Symmetry: C5
Subunit: 376 residues, 5 copies
């Protein structure tokens, strides 16, 4: 992920122009090789036309250039790219939202699975660890980075997400399908056991735990589905073919022809097709948006930071359910206890935000007449 | 389903160009017959114009070609295709999401329907089997592959999704409408019975079971609705007519005319309409995206793998509610028990992912001045 | 509804071409009158130009044709049609999803409202009948077909959805607004009564019943809202005017002019504006998609089959809550009881679906090196 | 709201053509002044060119007309209008769906807040009245019509939505922000009190009441947010500027030039720019769709009927929770009690809907071969 | 936020034209510098061409202008801008909806956490303060304005959102990740404690509290995700490059050439490229919509008013859970107690809204024939 939110907090004169000076996750980094290849083919054709071809071959080449320039229709490709890239971007965001996070579970577990003794700690930590383990199993199934970090289940065990006895149970299960769901079933069994023992004090709490468990498990499964059900291959091929057909038509039709021949619209030979190169950058980069996001769990600069998320989720969940369990500060009167109203101070840099009227609703400046306000 | 996610993990120089070398689920496999027919008509017209028609007929043919080329407007067809194909693709994904999965139910059942004895096993297995049976009944109603696998209810019985006594009850129900919902009602009755017997220990657990049951049943019904309510036929006909009208205009108007006649824009005769063929591939393949996805439960390469899903769902659900019931590893101290913090190791191939700053929020580099930070 | 899902299970060579041979719900059935009128006006103008007008009038007519052809801009109309028709299609699907179905309620009622005696049957049947009655009242308010079936409340009573005493209570309620909601309030009161009597055994079950009741009632109300809040009239008028303006410009500008006059682009007189007629079919049919779906509760071929749904919902709900109540087959060992794994057989026509690898995740072919897999 | 749903139940030959004869909520009513102004400017320029300007001034005017006609590019404006108007229409529907309705609350209250005595009536009526009062407070904050009906809180009190003692409490609260939420907090306190007194019989019922209360309150708050967070002003200004730039280019470039000058494409002087006027109607009306809907709580013909909804919601809620409380008809055998199946009659006008096959699923006509159906 | 809802309540003749006279949040304020730069470059080139270049240089310049004008294709940029800006606007609204509000929590807390004594007040106030504190921590992480108001945690403590003892606990937690979630875990622990002490009277109430807590926490986390996962940088760069390429092509190709040279379409030299400047305003302002909204938590005029929301949320939550706790007006007969029906009065300005028929449904004017209404 290349976060540039801070850079675009305000719409400034430099604005998005500043972003053109970024390299990581940039269009340049993703497209310079393709741009070099396109320019190489264009210049090879231009050099042949300028130095190799005979006069008759040169006339035929000019004829072909004129014919080919007619098929560089950018409107169709613009359409198909817009629709396809929009689909891919929306799917990219949906996939990010399907990342399984433990926060809801950790809040519930800290609030419902009780006991300061070692057994209560074991319950809370084990529940959260099962959640993290399910997330790890699915992510290593769908994320190249996570797989490289956990290339075998042994690595998961050595990382401490799975115990040796748990690994015995995990392998002993006879299934040919991805077992990422197994720790969720373990979670359910352990929660039921905790309720039976009274560590969970009420049936509503167990219901809440199971509900949040199923939310988390469902997000895991959604990651599996997105990984399995690619964007339809035919659609990706169609868009790629459309773009490459336009680029072929441009590679031929944008050749600079000898101005002496006097062809209509071929009178200036810049020797470098500047605007065609800009158009190539535009359209190829538009498709590169899809190329990068179509699988957000790769190692692209803008692919999701899955390993960082694994680390953060584990650390925070453990903190919340173990160190923070039943560890409140003493209830004390807050600063605004005796104040009927309340408003925190403003700094010098922000007090200007005050004196802006507190919006009450769009209707409170109509200022009707007295005769209008009398009830029938 | 043709999964190529692994191939596009990273945006690479080859990128989507590599995908053009795939056959299964490809544009080529879906369109080569139509391309051959289009080329055959084009070449038949060209051969007539070149070898059969008289001089006067040839002049009239050239006139008609010039007239027809004016109506090859690709912008309208591009519009209609974009909107229609986008509708179809979104509906395709929605249908996939409506596939009924047992995972939520199996977690709840493993956590709430109790007893290691044979009766507890019977309860858990029967509940999950009713879920699977409902899924089978709807899928055989909507999926050609599943129907071919279960062409009659007798096949469902022999597969063990339905018992002989259950089949007697199923047929004895007098209804002219699809009975896919029947096992859901059986599920509800059985859950209520289990609660009455105390196999389900609390009313909240029964409520949770019924809630997840209705989620699953609703997904089944959504499959029925999608199967019944086709994309409006008039819309599909409109898009097909638009595309074929463009292709007619191209079949005539893209004919190569004798360059000797000196017609404007007809000076080069390539004898093969390369860019028109590419445009046909583009647009016809764009519509073929819809043709493949408009019913995702067929046998296309990119249609959903319904039978694999039936097998996986049954096997996993049975595992989770029977073999994994109350079969936890002993609660033991985890690797990070004594660690206030925690972070699993990184492999050599991934340690580079570390040393990337842990994002805290976009605001934490503003670096205000001392006088700005004082409260009013 | 014209269901053609079976026809498009696979993308075939004939593909959507076969659909062009369908009449029910077709573009032809919806547009042949408009096509005849358009052709009649075009041919009347052509006949006047060919046989009535004088030479000077003929020259002025040619001038006007040339001027008018300039304003046949299809891109604006294509835009407006795309956006408007897409809005209408999405709203069409949303309306279908707002159809009130009893399945969730019937599952809950069968599972929660108890007693094999006549009073338990009365409770279950009456609850489901109240649901069906609310659906009938709203549908007769919004569906022309349903209204024709139930033109007065007396018809509802004779159909048995409402009892005579219920009808007395219904009419005695003093309200000038649609009373479709009344049976939902009756449902709530009856459920509360059943809980008081212990026919509903727990408060969680009553809560679940009321939750599903409100889901159903909300769908009824959504039907009322969609019926009341039309697509904004100004938008429909705008799209209609845009389309008719294009068709006016075409009716004039596509007239075939005397080739002898030698006007640019007017050299061939086909006497039938084939491609203009195809364009009219395209664009007018695109709008006809909206014309049919803008109210899906009419009697169009592709309008929803509301009466069939009323019949099916009533019959199935009654079956589920009366005949199927507490009528399970004896719990028996399933076919896969002794099998650690499980997989139902495949038929000859489908065994080929096997031997396709069971997808495990996109990451499981990376095949890293030994030195890469060592933890830091 | 201008409801024309009945008019478009079926796609008819007249179809949307009939809608062009409507005035209320019409494009004509919203645009005739702008059309008159556009025509006035056009005709003033034409009259100057025809009767005031000298020959040299006339030549310069023709030059300027030719130059200006080049910038009447309708594709950009069509794009921006499509995207912007679509945003506004979707937001319009979302706002309508955020209208707070009491139906869910009234069902729950009738089912859960008990007692036929005056105190039970007081509880039920007061709860529903608090809901209605919150709706009134927010609507008078966001709806010009509602504000005109309730220009001061005194009007709310005299309308009986708020009592005098309640008004004392309401004003005594020290807050500078809109207090529409206050009756929701009152609702919560009153529900808790009713539970303490046992008028609400169980904790699940209180939970359900509070859940629906928060749904209702959230809809109120969503109305506040939509009122506060306008469509970004810059976007509205951009679209307006684009449209007016096109109309400027047309006002100049569509002037009819003297045909004697022999300018290309200026040979016919109709003296009335018919198709330009139609284009103005099209595009300006397209923007007028947004102008009307951008605030749906005004007094436009197609703005929401907020006061009618207030009246209906109050009357229906009071009916449901007071007159209909525990007022069921005696449970009696329904018409289909003894019938294993059930189907209500059809009228003469609708019996034709029967004999249409009952859809069972798209797979049930495949008709496989005997050898294909044998299990492996 | 620049609220102009009141201004566009009705579609008026002035309509959106009035909005063009606004400065705050306007296109002018966001774009005048860029417009000045564009005009400066254009005029510098024009002055060079008019006063510096030699005759031969002038001919070459005219050649280059003619060549460059060919690449000012506005359709591609219009496409990319439409799709990209639409994505950004939708994301903008989603982010606003992810703002964490306490209203649901405050209703629940006022209804479920009991006791008029100081301890009950402490419980209620502390719970709501934890919610507000979590919101403050995330907002200061994502909002430049809020960060400037709370540049250090010490400022949060002095504002009274966090207590000194709470701050000790907060810093003592060993985590390298944003701790905005910590007060949510505190909230959960405190709610569990209150239930143990009986301040919360039932387990359903605690479940409801935890559910709403997780809703609020999830909104906080969504703010973090939106802040972290920027709109993909490559996409923003692509759109910026497309726009700047068009503006380059215009800066060259829209130069006014000497009319004496007699170039086609270069005959009038206005010396100011009015319509090109309008097009620049259009397209650059369209992108400025994205530039402003891409981070809505900055200090743009149309960025969200985060500090106002913090103040309002804290003040209202405290009011609701402390001053309004168990402080109802005595239950009294409402104005419509004895009225079977009910309707509040209308004012003179609004009585016209009456006499509009109360909509009952679109079907109630069909007026069938007697023979049509008889049941079969
Ligand atoms: C005029 C353009 C349209 C041409 C129409 C298609 C002509 C190609 C026919 C290919 C027949 C493949 C036969 C097959 O059934 O083979 C299966 C096998 C598995 O396929 P799989 O690996 O995808 O699984 O095939 C493979 O192993 C890999 C097969 C590689 C396919 C290469 C063909 C595409 C090249 C077209 C290039 C277009 C212009 C650049
Ligand atoms: C100029 C283009 C517009 C022409 C306007 C339509 C002209 C065709 C009139 C068809 C009258 C059908 C009468 C009918 O009501 O028949 C019902 C019956 C059931 O219809 P069903 O099977 O759909 O159910 O009809 C059937 O059985 C199958 C009927 C087959 C319909 C064939 C007509 C479409 C061919 C147009 C081709 C367009 C150019 C390629
Ligand atoms: C150049 C194109 C723009 C022209 C601008 C509009 C000119 C028409 C002015 C109509 C004044 C209507 C006065 C009115 O306020 O009348 C109310 C009454 C109820 O209206 P309501 O029934 O909708 O409810 O009016 C009715 O009863 C039915 C009224 C029928 C309206 C017919 C006017 C539209 C015809 C334009 C055709 C455009 C070219 C084909
Ligand atoms: Ca990637
Ligand atoms: Ca298919
Ligand atoms: Ca219809
Ligand atoms: Ca309005
Ligand atoms: Ca901003
Ligand atoms: Cl619950």
């Amino acid at each position: 992920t290349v976060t540039y939110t801070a850079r675009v907090a305000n719409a400034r004169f430099g604005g998005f122009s500043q972003l053109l000076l970024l390299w990581r996750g940039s269009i340049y980094k993703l497209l310079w090789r393709e741009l070099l290849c396109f320019l190489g083919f264009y210049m090879a054709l231009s050099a042949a036309y300028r130095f190799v071809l005979t006069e008759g071959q040169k006339r035929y080449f000019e004829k072909l250039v004129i014919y080919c320039d007619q098929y560089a229709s950018l409107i169709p490709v613009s359409f198909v790219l817009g629709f396809y890239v929009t689909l891919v971007v929306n799917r990219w965001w949906s996939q990010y939202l399907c990342m399984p996070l433990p926060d809801a579970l950790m809040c519930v577990v800290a609030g419902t699975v009780h006991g300061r003794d070692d057994r209560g700690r074991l319950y809370r930590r084990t529940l959260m660890r099962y959640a993290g383990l399910s997330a790890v199993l699915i992510l290593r199934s769908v994320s190249t980075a996570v797989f490289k970090r956990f290339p075998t289940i042994d690595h998961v065990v050595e990382a401490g997400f799975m115990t040796r006895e748990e690994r015995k149970k995990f392998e002993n299960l006879n299934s040919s399908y991805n077992k990422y769901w197994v720790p969720c079933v373990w979670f359910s069994n352990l929660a039921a056991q905790a309720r039976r023992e009274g560590r969970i004090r009420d049936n509503s709490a167990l219901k809440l735990l199971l509900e949040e468990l199923n939310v988390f498990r469902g997000k895991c499964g959604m990651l599996f589905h997105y990984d399995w059900i690619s964007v339809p291959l035919v659609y990706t091929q169609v868009v790629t073919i459309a773009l490459y057909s336009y680029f072929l038509a441009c590679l031929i039709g944008r050749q600079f022809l000898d101005p002496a021949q006097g062809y209509k619209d071929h009178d200036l030979d810049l020797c470098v097709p500047i605007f065609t190169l800009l158009q190539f950058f535009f359209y190829a980069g538009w498709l590169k948006v899809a190329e990068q996001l179509i699988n957000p769990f790769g190692e692209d600069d803008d692919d999701f930071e899955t390993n960082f998320l694994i680390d953060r989720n584990f650390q925070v969940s453990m903190l919340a359910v173990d160190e923070m369990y039943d560890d409140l500060a003493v209830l004390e009167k807050d600063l605004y206890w005796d104040a009927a109203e309340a408003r925190a101070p403003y700094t010098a840099a922000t007090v200007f935000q005050l004196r802006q009227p507190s919006f009450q609703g769009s209707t409170f400046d109509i200022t009707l007449a007295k005769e209008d306000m009398q009830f029938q």
